[PDB]
Amino acid sequence: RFLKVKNWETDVVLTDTLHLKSTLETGCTEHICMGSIMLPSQHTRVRTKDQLFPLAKEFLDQYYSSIKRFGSKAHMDRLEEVNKEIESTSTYQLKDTELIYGAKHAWRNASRCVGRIQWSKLQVFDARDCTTAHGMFNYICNHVKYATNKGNLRSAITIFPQRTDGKHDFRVWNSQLIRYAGYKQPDGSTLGDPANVQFTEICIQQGWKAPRGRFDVLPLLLQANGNDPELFQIPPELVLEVPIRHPKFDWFKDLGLKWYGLPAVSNMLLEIGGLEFSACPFSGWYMGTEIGVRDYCDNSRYNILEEVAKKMDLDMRKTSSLWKDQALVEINIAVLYSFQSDKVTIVDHHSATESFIKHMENEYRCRGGCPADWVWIVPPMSGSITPVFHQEMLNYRLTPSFEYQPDPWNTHVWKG
């Protein structure tokens, strides 16, 4: 059965056959669409030998198809070798090749990621020999340094050992490798990034000495082999930051804003052939609106719209002056200007959405489809003047995949 999607701006129609290879569930039914549910139970992540070999077999079938070896003796022996290793040890180990393929395809399958044109150029760092939080710190430092590359960012992922009985997990307790602290003041106001208050408090409790600034880079909190997590300061010379200035407004620098250059998601779960990699930091480079629109302007984040609008001297009385929209654009121009001026890799939302359309069309032709979450692909500003707004998209889940998982501080059994 075939399915068509139409671009209502260009009338291009594309036929999805890839959705037939969909295993996991969306969250929707014939009678309810959960398309805007943020983290439905299906996107979040204790797995026995019973269901594991089918998951292994399908991954390996995919893998050997991509390398044009489906049904080869190499393919059959690997299936055999995996089968016996599962029944003998209740799990199995991916070869290096399989790990690299898995990690790339997980990104390729990330239906919410507008950045996927880049999916084949992923630097995969195998940290499966890691055993301690200190060893995790070292792997993450090398990741950050390689990825940052003095501003010329390179996509990378570092893969720590897979889950076994779920009692010995490797977890990075930070949502992202580099994030600013947030402090709840007694007067109710927040200093720093309000999204990080809960995490900041954990770090402080774990012994972090907080400078209590507006842009304190948080320490790494690292759990190895299911042990209690341990604090580590990322070396400051490894955290590349960009002071934010505006190309026409000289008063903008005096807002004291900066942001880090390396977006690196560290709290997601990488699933490859039934194996669960609970610690798999990955990184790329920023789309400008992630900082300019969400980080700075969300009411529940730094929320500088008011101050920026005040300094532009906009009509802030009625909303219908669109003072909020006017300031948002200027803040986002500044983010882009500052990164480009400092030669830190960044993409504006127009370029990124156009690229994703090309990627998506290419994927329908070479792959039979491209799963895409419209709710997430459309940028959080100027949506309809980017070409993804007008693009019908089919959302379905392929594996390998990145899944959410509960924050470890809610599931961890503390040792002491």
Ligand X SMILES: C[C@H](O)[C@H](O)[C@H]1CNc2nc(N)[nH]c(=O)c2N1
Ligand Y SMILES: Cc1cc(N)nc(CCc2cc(CC[C@H]3CCCN3C)cc(F)c2F)c1
Taking CA 148 as the corner, what is the angle to CA 157 and CA 130, rounded to the nearest 5 degrees?
40
The stretches of 216-278 forming alpha helices (DSSP H) are none
CB of 40 within 8 A of CB of 415? no
Residue 157: which of ligand X, Zn ion, ligand HEM, none does it interact with, CB under 5 to 8 A by kind?
Answer: ligand HEM
Among ligand HEM, ligand X, a second copy, none, residue 413 binds (CB under 5-8 Å by kind): none
Considering only residues 267 to 296 of the shown chain, the ones binding a second copy according to CB under 8 A are 288, 293-294
State the catalytic residue, choosing from 78, 116, 179, 245.
Answer: 116
Token pair in block for residue 164: 């076994």
Q: Are strands 123-126 and 156-159 parallel, antiparallel or unpaired?
A: parallel
CB of 190 or CB of 283, closer to ligand Y: 283
List contacts with ligand X (CB under 6 A): 8, 36, 38, 375-376, 389-392
User: Applying CB under 6 A, which residues contact ligand HEM?
Assistant: 107, 110, 112-115, 118, 122, 155, 157, 282, 284-285, 287, 290, 347, 352, 376, 402
Residues that bind ligand Y (CB under 6 A): 38, 115, 263, 265, 268, 282-287, 290, 402
For the beta sheet containing 269-272, the strands, ordered from the edge strand earlier in sequence to the opposite edge, are 275-277, 269-272, 401-403
Q: Is 285 annotated as catalytic?
A: yes
Apex 349 CA angle, 357 and 245, nearest 5? 165
Q: Which position among 208, 285, 323, 363 bears the catalytic label? A: 285
Q: Which of 380, 404, 407, 412 binds a second copy (CB under 8 A)?
A: 380
Catalytic residue (one of 201, 290, 306, 354): 290
State yes or no: is 241 an active-site residue. Answer: no
Phi, psi of 275 (to 5 degrees): -85, 145
> Does 375 belong to an annotated binding site?
yes
Indicate if 8 belongs to the active site.
no
- Respond yes or no: is residue 290 known to be catalytic: yes
**Is it true that the peptide bond before 400 is cis, omega within 30 degrees of 0?**
yes
Rounded to the nearest whole angstrom, what is the least distance from the CB of residue 137 to ligand X in the complex? 29
**Residue 189 lies near a second copy (rule: CB under 8 A):** no
For residue 131, give Cα distances in angstroms to 98, 228, 235.
21, 13, 21
Q: Which is nearer to ligand X, 62 or 283 (CB)?
A: 283
70: tokens are 């489906």
Annotated binding residue at 404? Answer: yes
Nearer to ligand HEM, 60 or 287 (CB): 287
How far apart, in whole angstroms, are the C-alpha atoms of residue 270 and residue 400?
Answer: 7
d(CA 312, CA 237) in angstroms, rounded, equals 34
Neighbours of 161 (CB within 10 A): 20
Phi, psi (deg, nearest 5) at residue 384? -80, -10
Applying CB under 8 A, the site for a second copy has a residue count of: 65
* Residue 113 annotated as binding site: yes
DSSP 8-state secondary structure symbol assigned to residue 203: H
How far is the first Cα of the chain from the last one, in angstroms, to the nearest whole number?
56
Q: For the purposes of burial, counting CB atoms within 10 Å of the CB of 51, is it exposed (0-12), middle (13-18) or buried (19 or more)?
A: exposed
28 binds Zn ion (CB under 5 A): yes
The entry of ligand HEM, ligand X, a second copy, none that residue 25 binds, CB within 5 to 8 Å by partner kind: a second copy
Binding string, residues 340-379; x marks residues near a second copy by CB under 8 A? x-------x-xx---------------------xxx--xx
User: Are the C-beta atoms of residues 369 and 394 closer than 8 Å to each other?
Assistant: yes
Residues that bind Zn ion (CB under 5 A): 28, 33, 35
Residues at the interface with a second copy (CB under 8 A): 3, 5-6, 8-9, 19, 22, 25-38, 288, 293-294, 297-300, 305, 319-322, 324-326, 328-329, 332-333, 336, 340, 348, 350-351, 373-375, 378-385, 389-397
Annotated binding site: 36, 113, 176, 285-286, 290, 375-376, 389, 404
Residues with a known catalytic role:
113, 116, 285, 290
